[PDB]
Amino acid sequence: MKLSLTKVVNGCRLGKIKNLGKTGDHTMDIPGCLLYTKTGSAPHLTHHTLHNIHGVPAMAQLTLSSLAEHHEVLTEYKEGVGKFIGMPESLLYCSLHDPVSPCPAGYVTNKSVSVWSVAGRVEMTVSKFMAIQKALQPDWFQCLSDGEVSCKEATSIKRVRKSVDRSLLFLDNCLRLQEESEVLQKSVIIGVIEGGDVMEERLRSARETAKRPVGGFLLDGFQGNPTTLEARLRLLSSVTAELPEDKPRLISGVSRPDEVLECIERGVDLFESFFPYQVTERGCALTFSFDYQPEITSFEINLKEKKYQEDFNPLVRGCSCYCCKNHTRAYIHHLLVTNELLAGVLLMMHNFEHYFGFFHYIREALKSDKLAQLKELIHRQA
Amino acid sequence: PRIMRLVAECSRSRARAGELWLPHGTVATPVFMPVGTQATMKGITTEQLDALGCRICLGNTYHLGLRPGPELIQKANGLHGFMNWPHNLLTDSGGFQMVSLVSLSEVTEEGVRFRSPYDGNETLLSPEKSVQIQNALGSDIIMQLDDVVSSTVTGPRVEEAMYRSIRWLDRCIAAHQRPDKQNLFAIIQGGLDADLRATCLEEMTKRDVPGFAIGGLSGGESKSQFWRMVALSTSRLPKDKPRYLMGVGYATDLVVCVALGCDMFDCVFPTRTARFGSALVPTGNLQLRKKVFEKDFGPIDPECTCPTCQKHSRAFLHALLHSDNTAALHHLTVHNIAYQLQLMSAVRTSIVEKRFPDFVRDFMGAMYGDPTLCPTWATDALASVGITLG
RNA sequence: AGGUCGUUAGUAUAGUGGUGAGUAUCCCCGCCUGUCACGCGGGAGACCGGGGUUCGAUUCCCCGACGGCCUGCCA
Ligand SMILES: Nc1nc2cc[nH]c2c(=O)[nH]1
Ligand SMILES: [Zn+2]
Ligand SMILES: [Zn+2]
Numbered sequence: 001m002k003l004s005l006t007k008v009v010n011g012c013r014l015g016k017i018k019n020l021g022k023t024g025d026h027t028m029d030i031p032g033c034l035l036y037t038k039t040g041s042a043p044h045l046t047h048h049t050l051h052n053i054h055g056v057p058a059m060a061q062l063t064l065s066s067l068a069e070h071h072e073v074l075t076e077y078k079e080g081v082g083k084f085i086g087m088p089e090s091l092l093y094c095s096l097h098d099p100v101s102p103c104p105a106g107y108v109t110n111k112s113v114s115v116w117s118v119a120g121r122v123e124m125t126v127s128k129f130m131a132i133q134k135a136l137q138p139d140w141f142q143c144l145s146d147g148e149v150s151c152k153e154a155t156s157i158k159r160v161r162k163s164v165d166r167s168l169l170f171l172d173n174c175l176r177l178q179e180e181s182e183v184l185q186k187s188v189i190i191g192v193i194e195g196g197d198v199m200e201e202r203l204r205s206a207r208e209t210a211k212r213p214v215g216g217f218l219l220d221g222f223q224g225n226p227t228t229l230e231a232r233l234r235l236l237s238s239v240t241a242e243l244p245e246d247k248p249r250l251i252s253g254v255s256r257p258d259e260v261l262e263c264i265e266r267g268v269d270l271f272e273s274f275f276p277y278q279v280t281e282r283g284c285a286l287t288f289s290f291d292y293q294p295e296i297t298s299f300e301i302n303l304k305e306k307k308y309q310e311d312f313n314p315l316v317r318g319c320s321c322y323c324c325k326n327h328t329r330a331y332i333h334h335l336l337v338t339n340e341l342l343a344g345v346l347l348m349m350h351n352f353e354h355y356f357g358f359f360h361y362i363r364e365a366l367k368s369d370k371l372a373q374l375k376e377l378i379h380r381q382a
Numbered sequence: 383p384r385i386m387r388l389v390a391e392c393s394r395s396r397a398r399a400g401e402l403w404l405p406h407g408t409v410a411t412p413v414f415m416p417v418g419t420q421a422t423m424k425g426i427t428t429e430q431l432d433a434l435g436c437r438i439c440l441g442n443t444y445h446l447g448l449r450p451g452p453e454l455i456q457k458a459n460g461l462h463g464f465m466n467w468p469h470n471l472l473t474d475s476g477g478f479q480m481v482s483l484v485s486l487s488e489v490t491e492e493g494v495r496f497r498s499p500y501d502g503n504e505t506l507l508s509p510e511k512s513v514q515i516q517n518a519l520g521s522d523i524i525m526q527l528d529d530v531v532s533s534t535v536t537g538p539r540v541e542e543a544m545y546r547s548i549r550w551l552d553r554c555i556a557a558h559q560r561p562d563k564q565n566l567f568a569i570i571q572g573g574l575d576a577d578l579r580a581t582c583l584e585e586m587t588k589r590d591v592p593g594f595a596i597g598g599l600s601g602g603e604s605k606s607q608f609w610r611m612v613a614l615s616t617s618r619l620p621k622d623k624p625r626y627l628m629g630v631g632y633a634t635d636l637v638v639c640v641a642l643g644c645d646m647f648d649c650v651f652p653t654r655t656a657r658f659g660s661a662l663v664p665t666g667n668l669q670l671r672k673k674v675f676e677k678d679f680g681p682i683d684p685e686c687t688c689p690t691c692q693k694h695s696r697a698f699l700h701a702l703l704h705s706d707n708t709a710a711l712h713h714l715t716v717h718n719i720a721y722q723l724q725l726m727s728a729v730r731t732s733i734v735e736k737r738f739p740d741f742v743r744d745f746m747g748a749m750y751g752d753p754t755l756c757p758t759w760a761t762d763a764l765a766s767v768g769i770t771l772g
Numbered sequence: 773a774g775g776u777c778g779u780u781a782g783u784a785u786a787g788u789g790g791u792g793a794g795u796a797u798c799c800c801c802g803c804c805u806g807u808c809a810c811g812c813g814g815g816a817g818a819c820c821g822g823g824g825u826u827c828g829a830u831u832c833c834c835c836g837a838c839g840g841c842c843u844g845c846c847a
Contacts, residue, residue, distance in 0.1 A: 039705045120783025341425040499808045648806040
């Protein structure tokens with residue numbers, strides 16, 4: 001791993017990793033997102049349509065929940081997972097459970113965790129988890145952890161302390177088991193930080209986790225109602241003070257355009273990218289602008305209304321996706337009301353492209369260090 | 383001014399091989415055309431379809447006149463502009479809704495009254511209205527409204543339908559307004575009765591029509607009547623204009639009927655059967671949800687050339703179909719359309735270079751193995767025209 | 773260590789000392805010929821284990837296992 005830091009201004013890191021993958025020949029920019037997938041491919045897209053999207057990033061994001069079922073097949077294939085799913089040119093990262101479908105609380109013990117798949121609920125100990133990682137051969141993989149406390153929003157200190165100790169035990173055990181073997185040695189392992197809503201725990205966890213040769217960190221349990229968005233923002237800046245400044249930072253559960261611009265401020269590198277999927281599944285289309293130089297007003301438009309039935313215009317002026325080059329609003333309304341499949345495809349191709357554009361623009365602006373103007377432009381709408 | 387040019391005609395049978403000269407480019411006959419009713423092909427963008435090779439597509443009148451309606455579709459520059467497709471189109475007359483939606487409508491000498499199957503409203507569909515709305519859509523071949531009865535009914539109902547269809551034919555000829563830009567196709571009716579169909583042929587051959595089509599032969603019925611009816615129809619029709627057989631889609635049927643002198647086909651089998659999870663192959667089909675395809679690392683078909691048969695294996699498609707992601711239904715569709723297009727091209731080239739009778743033997747051998755195990759209804763049809771296998 | 777609560781299909785939840793144990797999802801078969809169709813039918817699959825009470829035990833009492841919570845010990 002190699003971290004570059006061109007500029008660090010106002011607690012807004014800018015950089016690029018240059019030595020990652022097999023042995024190199026790959027570069028990843030910071031900050032960025034990861035492509036979101038369901039069991040292999042992007043949702044509603046096949047490889048032909050997927051390559052009509054401009055600016056797809058270089059690393060994807062599998063979920064252990066979706067792929068855990070098909071485990072006895074990948075061992076027979078013997079050759080990794082970028083070759084089984086026919087995407088043999090990108091890095092991969094295997095998270096534990098997907099952010100869209102939350103995990104009901106009240107199943108974590110001191111021996112195993114649980115994950116909700118299509119066939120039901122399956123619990124896993126340390127050995128199973130290491131075996132699956134060996135079979136899949138992904139570049140990165142988040143260790144087995146304990147994060148059941150986010151659901152309660154209020155509980156005794158005993159549960160929180162028990163959680164922190166649990167997570168430490170898991171990390172140590174898996175570190176040793178991976179060290180022993182051979183194939184696993186070419187994949188990096190990342191650390192997890194939790195502690196609820198206590199300063200003491202949020203400090204002790206970070207202090208104790210920093211003293212292991214993991215290669216990056218995960219900050220877990222920082223989402224909630226807009227009524228606590230100061231007590232869930234000072235804590236973060238206090239936390240990111242006990243971690244070495246040479247490894248990437250990841251944050252889970254934050255994907256709205258407005259919370260991201262403030263989560264980056266305390267120092268964070270990589271983000272999930274599932275929000276455009278939500279805004280698509282509901283039937284709407286993203287329309288906010290992020291061009292700073294030139295839902296209240298326009299954050300998305302709803303296309304099942306009646307006003308969009310004699311409307312002959314693209315969804316967004318100047319969008320370069322396939323939809324905005326060929327079709328009109330009337331046609332998409334006709335598709336939506338009459339319940340067609342092509343509507344999902346044409347809207348996903350637009351929402352993804354819009355979001356990726358946003359991340360490219362914010363990275364460029366942070367390079368030029370004009371984040372205040374863009375923050376004001378985004379805030380005044382949603 | 384004829385629209386068909388002949389190139390090569392089999393010297394052993396009655397198969398032909400030619401080309402159509404339509405207002406948007408030209409098509410090499412025979413041809414198969416897939417069908418997309420509500421101004422889209424189900425689940426697949428037009429660029430994919432165009433790049434697969436296809437050259438002419440379908441549409442429907444009842445549905446499009448219901449919602450969104452003629453008034454704004456005309457304002458969207460017809461169904462070419464509305465759908466965004468740079469090739470030829472062919473628009474059906476909505477007469478099939480008269481047998482599919484049988485228990486939802488009534489018909490008199492004035493028209494047909496339909497109660498919508500999405501909200502129970504009733505309206506009228508008469509020959510003038512049907513031809514008018516089709517004139518608004520602006521296709522390349524336009525069909526006349528006809529009084530379709532089921533191919534499983536008897537009684538004086540068939541005679542009424544035949545004569546009413548003739549009367550409506552003359553009314554809609556008088557109602558046609560763009561004789562230069564569209565080709566109206568008389569539709570031959572008569573069920574499965576020799577005399578009635580002969581009368582229909584004799585009567586409506588006297589009218590001036592660019593083309594002729596053969597109707598009322600679809601779904602489940604004895605195939606022994608089916609091929610005899612096609613053979614009767616083909617001989618009486620003239621040789622300077624295309625034939626057209628409506629609603630046949632399986633492979634064996636296509637080949638046999640090519641040998642008997644047909645030129646065009648239509649069906650919904652491949653697209654719809656894709657969305658239920660099944661694929662088409664030189665030996666039949668595969669159902670990619672069974673457990674037998676779970677660890678099978680080869681392609682769908684080694685000799686295929688579709689985008690799907692070059693990247694992905696059977697195991698991956700099996701695993702992907704078991705999730706909620708719908709992208710797995712856009713792979714099967716591409717394969718099935720490609721499959722259908724290749725077969726017609728192969729047969730045509732087989733006949734141009736004077737080898738057609740030996741294409742059939744190989745195809746039967748592949749499909750059924752020993753050429754002595756073909757359906758008995760295909761042996762009779764082939765042996766009647768000259769092609770002998772076994 | 774002690775106290776207390778709980779255990780029903782592959783995976784969730786109603787229900788009772790006398791019910792073919794209910795429902796929704798997985799699993800297994802069948803149907804598709806110019807679209808009422810990402811559809812429509814049919815099937816299969818369970819009361820932790822042991823002992824006692826009761827005409828009858830998934831229903832009442834006792835033991836074991838496994839797990840949660842509280843206390844004790846310890847930090
Ligand atoms: N108009 C019309 N369409 C179809 C489609 C299949 N058969 C028929 C028919 O007889 N008439
Ligand atoms: Zn767009
Ligand atoms: Zn193929």
